[PDB]
């Protein structure tokens, strides 16, 4: 039998089979109520429902809705049953101890999982790349984390959190396009701006130079065609949008960009591990998909790192799903088989066994 890999995020859930190379199910983390819908179905009926997001900045804030998402995951999405399979769940870096315990309780007692495991999302992305030691920048829909990992251990003292991700960038693009002329008022219009962001936007190597280029010619402009046929044109907004990742000031934030956040995390580690981290900086999450982010991150960290240092930014071509894939690799390993938590082991110990088994 094969295990299941469930990767829950702030915006999207990824579900499938340990052994597979891609999640079979990908759907929004939305629970809708006026009796209860989950995912794709709920986004359509938004007109007659109040929509809830159980996962805020990677952290589960509502447990009743999280149960409903997980239920829809097996029965509706994967068309399987939880008590037949081991389940690999993913957690956010620096996830509260109680959340981890509640996550373990819900699986065993509510779904009767014969086995389960909870792994840190960034640690899995590092595994997916084929590394066990390195630093992961995970930028999703709700949160950006810089996570230094030593031989499978995420180093809690060195993890940094920044509440600036895809959702914030989608909202920023709406705003700067609004300033340029267009009006985006409906949620069906936001889902367009989000698509514009995912299709055309890119990270400039030199922002100020790129701004000068956009002001002198139309060479950087792209045309996005709408469903009704009408075409919209985007200039410097293409790179001004993901620039907010490097200058949170663009959003009115008093925070370091993803580059200096990565640097600051490496500098919180033991001096003798940094030279491996600088050369094993892996990018993961949907918000790291912008063309030219790897080269920009490379450029910016080079300015902060020692001049003798080898800087290497790994941007796996698929990295939008490296968390799930890293789990699909982990749960499929014959060497990992004895690191699950059996239902027996839970019944004997209780929820708090998660800490002594999952690290």
């Amino acid at each position: 039998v094969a295990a299941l890999v469930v990767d829950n995020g702030s915006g999207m859930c990824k579900a499938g089979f340990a052994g597979d190379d891609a999640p079979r199910a990908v759907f929004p983390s939305i629970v809708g109520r006026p009796d209860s819908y989950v995912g794709d179905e709920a986004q359509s009926k938004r007109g007659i429902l109040t929509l809830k997001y159980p996962i805020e900045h990677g952290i589960v804030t509502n447990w009743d809705d999280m149960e409903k998402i997980w239920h829809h995951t097996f029965y509706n999405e994967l068309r399987v049953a939880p008590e037949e399979h081991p389940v690999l769940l993913t957690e956010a870096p620096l996830n509260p101890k109680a959340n981890r315990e509640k996550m373990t309780q819900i699986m065993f007692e509510t779904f009767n999982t014969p086995a389960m495991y909870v792994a840190i999302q960034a640690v899995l992305s590092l595994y997916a790349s084929g590394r066990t030691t390195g630093i992961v920048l995970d930028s999703g829909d709700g949160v950006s984390h810089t996570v230094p990992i030593y031989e499978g251990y995420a180093l809690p003292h060195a993890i940094l959190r920044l509440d600036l991700a895809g959702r914030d960038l989608t909202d920023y693009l709406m705003k700067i396009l609004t300033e340029r002329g267009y009006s985006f008022t409906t949620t069906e219009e936001r889902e367009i701006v989000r698509d514009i962001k995912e299709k055309l936007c890119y990270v400039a190597l030199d922002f100020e130079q790129e701004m000068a280029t956009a002001a002198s010619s139309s060479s950087l402009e792209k045309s996005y065609e709408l469903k009704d046929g009408q075409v919209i044109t985007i200039g410097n907004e293409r790179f001004r949008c993901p620039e907010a990742l490097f200058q949170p000031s663009f959003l009115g934030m008093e925070a370091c960009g993803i580059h200096e956040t990565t640097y600051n995390s490496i500098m919180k580690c033991d001096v003798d591990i940094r030279k491996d981290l600088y050369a094993n900086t892996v990018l993961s999450g949907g918000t790291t998909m912008y063309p030219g982010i790897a080269d920009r991150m490379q450029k910016e960290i080079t300015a902060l790192a020692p001049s003798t240092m080898k800087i290497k930014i790994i941007a796996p071509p698929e990295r939008k799903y490296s968390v799930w894939i890293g789990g699909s690799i982990l749960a499929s390993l014959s060497t990992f088989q004895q690191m699950w938590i059996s239902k027996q082991e839970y019944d004997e110990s209780g929820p708090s066994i998660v800490h002594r088994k999952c690290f």
Binding site: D21, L333, T335, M339
Partner: peptide, 20 residues
């Protein structure tokens, strides 16, 4: 080599993944 040492060695070795 501990059970964990052999887990990290398998991750670094990599592995083949299934199809659809």
């Amino acid at each position: 080599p501990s059970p964990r040492e052999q887990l990290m060695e398998s991750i670094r070795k990599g592995k083949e993944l299934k199809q659809a």
